[PDB]
């Protein structure tokens, strides 16, 4: 028998549904709030570490954090606001202190993590509103190795961002530099990545909520990967088997095998017999979903 201890750290703002991001390996968690808009960064157990307000340089207007993403390896967060700006939240690394291995307890590690996150920095990427054309940053997504970033605005623009990890006197800082300016049909709902080898390549998929699932690679061209007769609801991707699943709003699912040029071939087509439909990977090769029903 088990019980869930509950921590409910209140915030002055209003929580967002899909704006909660969790690091895969490091025990970190961040989520957005609006009116007053900010971001709350907390550890896995629920204790609040830090809160970050409006991006620097704001002229008295509080900006809503519209997208959040965690770096897959670094303890680094990227936040796309609603006024076109883009910010990077980075705390000094604990291992940079080169102290002893006496951190055998969770409380001491939490304390040193908190004191490291207290002196964290929110850096602004230059000209982000220029690349997003003064549009709210709808979505963002890091690469598998965390070297490339993809950002999608509400003005139907997709921008590629390069991450530069430069060393300094006391810590390691990060700079995000824009590279491309790609036009999309609609603002992109979800950005997914495809790895070259199952376990540094450019292979991303953009779903804008319409009838387009546009692939993108190093060719700097938004060539579609798979387009179906209906508006897409969501895409679910398996990186190891390179298996794509496209689900539509009319309870239709299709299974594609992604090739090297990001092209899918249908092999499993199925139909399912207000809450939007959700679909996640239950197991490798096994997909679980529910349509807001009891089953």
């Amino acid at each position: 028998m088990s019980l869930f201890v509950v921590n409910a750290p209140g915030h002055e703002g209003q929580l967002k549904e899909q704006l909660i991001v969790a690091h895969k390996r490091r025990p970190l968690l961040a989520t957005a709030w609006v009116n007053p808009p900010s971001v709350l960064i907390t550890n896995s157990e629920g204790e609040v570490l830090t809160q970050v307000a409006d991006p620097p340089g704001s002229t008295g207007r509080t900006h809503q954090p519209t997208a959040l993403t965690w770096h897959p390896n670094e303890e680094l967060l990227v936040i796309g606001w609603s006024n076109g700006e883009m910010s990077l939240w980075s705390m000094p690394s604990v291992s940079s202190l080169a102290l002893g291995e006496d951190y055998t307890t969770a409380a001491a590690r939490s304390a040193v993590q908190l004191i490291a996150a207290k002196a964290a920095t929110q850096s602004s990427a230059e000209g982000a509103t220029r690349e997003h054309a003064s549009g709210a940053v709808v979505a963002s997504e890091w690469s598998t190795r965390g070297l490339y970033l993809v950002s999608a605005s509400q003005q139907r623009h997709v921008v590629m961002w390069m991450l530069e990890k430069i060393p300094a006197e006391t810590s390691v800082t990060f700079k995000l530099k824009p590279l491309w300016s790609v036009q999309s049909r609609e603002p992109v709902a979800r950005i997914i990545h495809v790895p070259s080898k199952a376990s540094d390549d450019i292979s991303f998929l953009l779903a804008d909520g319409g009838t387009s699932v546009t692939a993108i690679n190093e060719d700097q061209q938004l060539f579609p990967c798979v387009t179906q007769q209906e508006q897409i609801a969501s895409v679910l991707y398996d990186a190891a088997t390179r298996t794509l699943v496209t689900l539509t709003t009319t309870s239709m699912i299709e299974v594609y095998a992604v090739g090297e040029d990001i092209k899918g071939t249908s092999t499993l087509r199925r139909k399912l017999s207000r809450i939007a439909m959700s679909m996640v990977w239950a197991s490798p090769g096994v997909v679980a979903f529910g349509s807001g029903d009891d089953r």
């Binding site: 590629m160 390069m162 530069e164 530099k177 824009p178 590279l179 491309w180 540094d200 190093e218 700097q220």
Partner: protein
């Protein structure tokens, strides 16, 4: 003899390239561009680095107020040299893996059009 494209690297801001020079001894490629863009990337010339796509280092240097016009290399001592439209010449020497300036000069007379090393890498014209 065959040729085929096998990679592409975009400059930040989309700054147009005006000069490029690739080292032989270690592999430090160098690129330049307008608004004083100067970059030094490291590529592994071995076949293992070609299969694995080895780009270990990427450092954006600075010290030029305008377009980096000429980039040259010295392979006996791995010493880089760059120029500017404004009429300045900067030499760069590797300290512990990164790149730093060693000398900056400005003749304020004309625009440098070339410079090169001998096979021994002992004299620059």
């Amino acid at each position: 003899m065959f040729v085929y494209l096998s990679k592409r690297i975009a400059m930040p801001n989309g700054v147009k390239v005006t000069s490029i020079a690739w080292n032989d001894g270690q592999g430090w490629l160098a690129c330049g561009g307008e608004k004083g863009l100067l970059k030094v990337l490291k590529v592994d010339g071995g076949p293992q680095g070609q299969r694995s796509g080895g780009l270990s280092s990427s450092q954006t240097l600075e010290g030029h107020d305008t377009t980096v016009d000429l980039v040259t290399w010295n392979q006996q001592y791995c010493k880089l040299t760059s120029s500017d439209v404004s009429g300045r010449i900067i030499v760069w020497v590797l300290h512990k893996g990164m790149w730093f300036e060693e000398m900056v000069n400005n003749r304020n007379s004309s625009r440098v059009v070339d410079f090169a090393w001998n096979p021994s890498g002992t004299k620059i014209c």
